[PDB]
Design an enzyme around this catalytic site. Structure first.
Site, PDB file in Angstrom:
ATOM      1  N   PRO A   1      35.657  -8.925  84.329  1.00 39.86           N
ATOM      2  CG  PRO A   1      35.902  -6.571  84.192  1.00 39.86           C
ATOM      3  CD  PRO A   1      35.095  -7.759  83.619  1.00 39.86           C
ATOM      4  CB  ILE A   2      36.360 -11.148  89.363  1.00 40.04           C
ATOM      5  CG1 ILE A   2      35.634 -12.034  88.359  1.00 40.04           C
ATOM      6  CG2 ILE A   2      35.997 -11.551  90.782  1.00 40.04           C
ATOM      7  CD1 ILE A   2      36.168 -13.415  88.303  1.00 40.04           C
TER       8      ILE A   2
ATOM      9  NE  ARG B   1      29.838 -13.310  87.034  1.00 38.52           N
ATOM     10  CZ  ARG B   1      29.083 -13.534  85.966  1.00 38.52           C
ATOM     11  NH1 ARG B   1      28.719 -12.515  85.192  1.00 38.52           N
ATOM     12  NH2 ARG B   1      28.699 -14.769  85.665  1.00 38.52           N
TER      13      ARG B   1
ATOM     14  CG  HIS C   1      41.337 -10.896  90.056  1.00 35.22           C
ATOM     15  ND1 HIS C   1      40.828 -10.859  91.327  1.00 35.22           N
ATOM     16  CD2 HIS C   1      42.527 -11.507  90.151  1.00 35.22           C
ATOM     17  CE1 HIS C   1      41.687 -11.429  92.161  1.00 35.22           C
ATOM     18  NE2 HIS C   1      42.731 -11.833  91.469  1.00 35.22           N
TER      19      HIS C   1
END
Lengths: 60, 60, 60, 60, 60, 60
Positions: free
Chosen positions: A1-2, A39, B6
Site C-alpha cells: 500500500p502507498i 509506503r 492506494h
C-alpha cells in the site's frame, strides 16, 4: 500500500516521524499486510495553498 | 489532513471501513488534530495496474 | 495547469461535463492562461471509499 | 469534493487566492454541493519539474 | 521512485504490462536507481472523466 | 497521458531532464500515443518526508 498525506506546514520533525509510523501501523493492521510493504509520503501545504469553501485555511 | 491510500483490489467493505477508521485515528493522534478534520480517500488498484520492479504485482 | 477533482459517485454524465467546463474556465480566467492548456481529471470515489472524521461519508 | 491543481510557479498570492475561490464556486455550482464542502489544494511546480512532449515547459 | 500514470481506458492488459515495464526501466536508467525500488501505479480515466480545454476528450 | 513521479531530493537538473524525456518516450511508445500529448510532473520528497515500513527512508 502507498499512502500520501497532505498536511498544513508547521509540524516538527518529531510529529511527522510519529505520523509516518502510526499511519503505517494502522494500514498494516487493517489490511493484514506486512509492515515493510507500506509506503507513506508526506506533502506539506503552505497555509495559502489550501482552501476550504473557497477561502484560505489560514483565515479560518 | 487529507490522506489518499492506494491498495490492491480484493478487500471486503468491512476491512476498508476499518482501514478508514484506524488510519483516521492514527493521523488525529499523531498530529493532535481534531478527528473531524481528517479526510481519507481509498483508491483501489487492479492487480495488473500495479508494478514493482517493472513487473505486475499479480505476478509477484 | 492540471486539475484532479475527487467527487463521490452518483452524478450523471451531463453534470460531470459541466463540472469539467466550468472548472476549466475558472482556472483559465483566474490565471490568465489559454483555455486549451487546461487539463481536468475527474476521479469518482465509491461511497464506502471516502471517510470524514473516521467514518464513511455514506453513513454520515 | 477535493480538488488538487498543479500550476507552474510564478503567480502572485492574489492570483492564487482568486483561483481557489473561482474554482471552488465552479465545483459547487456544477455539482450542486454546499460551497463549504469544497476543498482545494494548490501545488506549484518548478519550471524544470514539468515536461511536455519530453521537454521542460521552461524551454517550450 | 513512485510513478502514477493517468491514461484513458481502452488498453489491453498486454499494453499496460508493457507500459509498466518500459516506464520502470526508463526511471531506473535515468536516475541510476535499482529497478526493484521503482513503483508504478496505473490509473485509468473514463473518456468522460477527462477534459482538455474544457471539453471531454471523448467528443474531441 | 499525465504522469506524476515522486522521487527523493538530491538529483541534478540533468538527471531530472533525462528522467522526463526517457519516461515520456516510454509512455508514448507503449501506448502508441503522440509524444506531444505526454505530460510529466516531477515531485521531490524531502528525505524525512518519505517512510518505508514505518521508518524514514533516510534512516534505513
Amino acid at each position: 500500500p502507498i499512502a500520501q498525506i497532505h498536511i498544513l506546514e508547521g509540524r516538527s520533525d518529531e510529529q511527522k516521524e510519529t505520523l509516518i509510523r502510526e499511519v503505517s501501523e494502522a494500514i498494516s493492521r487493517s489490511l493484514d499486510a506486512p509492515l515493510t510493504s507500506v509506503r507513506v509520503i508526506i506533502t506539506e501545504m503552505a497555509k495559502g495553498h489550501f482552501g476550504i469553501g473557497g477561502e484560505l485555511a489560514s483565515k479560518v
